[PDB]
Amino acid sequence: EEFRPEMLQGKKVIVTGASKGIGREMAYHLSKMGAHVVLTARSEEGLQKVVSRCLELGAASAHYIAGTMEDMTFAEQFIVKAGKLMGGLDMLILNHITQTSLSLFHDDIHSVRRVMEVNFLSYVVMSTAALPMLKQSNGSIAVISSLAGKMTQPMIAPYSASKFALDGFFSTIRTELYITKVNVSITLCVLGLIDTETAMKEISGIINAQASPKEECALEIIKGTALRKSEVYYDKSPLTPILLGNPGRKIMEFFSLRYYNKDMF
């Protein structure tokens, strides 16, 4: 099956971490496709600015609810509100991350808790809150991850821990939805280094690799999620999906189901 921008015309989409970077670009692409969009981040001003441009780009409707994903009550309330604002949900885009700087791990335990809370726990809170709505529309979740969520690199231990945690959790949920015959798709988006100002600022003088453009990245996520793919790899090397693909895991995953009591689902 091939992608059509028509697939997102009139769809009700949530985009977290939408005030800058990849999130803002997804907001923009979704608007040009004519979707109903509800955006979130902490910066009320930044969200206001992107909602304006969204309406201008051709968004069916554009809403925002500012807040921190450090608060689990906020994370779940946000979904309920957004769902009411659009009268449903077709696609949930879990994209925000808490701030992290490249550092050889030393003793920041409070940073590690904040990373797990924002980058991991909030995503499970929101997916659980959005699932009844998504079950109705036969919807989709896009879980934004990284190469650091499939492999390891120095100076990003807490971050890598959170992206790995998302893979572990959402891959279990995906399998669970499939075996219970629930038509809700889960797309884990494995991203390489991207053009975002925050990313580029963070790596400066530490990492030398070339970054991919944020606009193309945002579109590849949307396309992949719309096409209901389990995984999307977006990175400069075409070797990355073959190297990180892990068909061995896929074989083990399929074969292991033979030991489960089918009555459980």
Ligand X SMILES: NC(=O)c1ccc[n+]([C@@H]2O[C@H](COP(=O)([O-])OP(=O)(O)OC[C@H]3O[C@@H](n4cnc5c(N)ncnc54)[C@H](OP(=O)(O)O)[C@@H]3O)[C@@H](O)[C@H]2O)c1
Ligand Y SMILES: CC(C)(O)c1cccn2c(C3(c4ccc(Cl)cc4)CC3)nnc12
The DSSP output letter for 178 is H
Binders of ligand Y: how many residues, by CB under 6 A?
A: 27
Instruction: Give 260's contacts (C-beta < 8 A, 6+ positions apart).
Output: none
Q: Is 20 helix (H, G, I), strand (E, B) or coil?
A: coil
Residue type for position 116 = M
Q: Which residues pair with 119 in a beta bridge?
A: none
Give min distance, CB of 87 to ligand X, in A. 24
Q: Which residues pair with 12 in a beta bridge?
A: 36
The DSSP output letter for 194 is B
- Choice among 123, 159, 233, 234 that is catalytic: 159
Residues 128-167 as x/- pattern, contact with ligand Y by CB under 6 A: ------------------xxx----x--x--x--------
Closer of 85 and 124 to its own copies (Cβ): 124
Closer of 43 and 68 to its own copies (Cβ): 68
**Out of 3, 7, 32, 46, which residue is the one contacting ligand X (CB under 6 A)?**
46
Mutual angle of helices 122-137 and 157-179, in 10-degree steps: 30
Is 159 known to be catalytic?
A: yes
Q: Which residue is nearest to ligand X (CB)?
A: 21
Binders of its own copies: how many residues, by CB under 8 A?
A: 66
Distance of CA 118 to the CA centre of its chain: 12
**Out of 70, 167, 195, 202, which residue is the one contacting ligand Y (CB under 6 A)?**
202
* Catalytic residue annotation: 159
